[PDB]
């Protein structure tokens, strides 16, 4: 389970996913972000398996 923190101006929240590798998760998250109109900067922290977009 990897988590995505979405930090936007009109939309804020968090979500999670179960994926075999970080690369696979990123693709899932990117698709989601694109679909919900959230575009920004992505960061990944391996100790907490968290991706953040701003």
UniProtKB/Swiss-Prot annotation:
Q: Which residues form the sequence repeats?
A: 1-54
Q: Which domain of life is it from?
A: Bacteria
The places in or outside the cell where this protein is found are: Secreted, Cell wall
Name of this protein:
Immunoglobulin G-binding protein G
């Amino acid at each position: 389970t990897y988590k995505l923190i979405l930090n936007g101006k009109t939309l804020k929240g968090e979500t999670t996913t179960e994926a075999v590798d970080a690369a696979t998760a990123e693709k899932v998250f990117k698709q989601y972000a694109n679909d919900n109109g959230v575009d920004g900067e992505w960061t990944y922290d391996d100790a907490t398996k968290t991706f953040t977009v701003t």
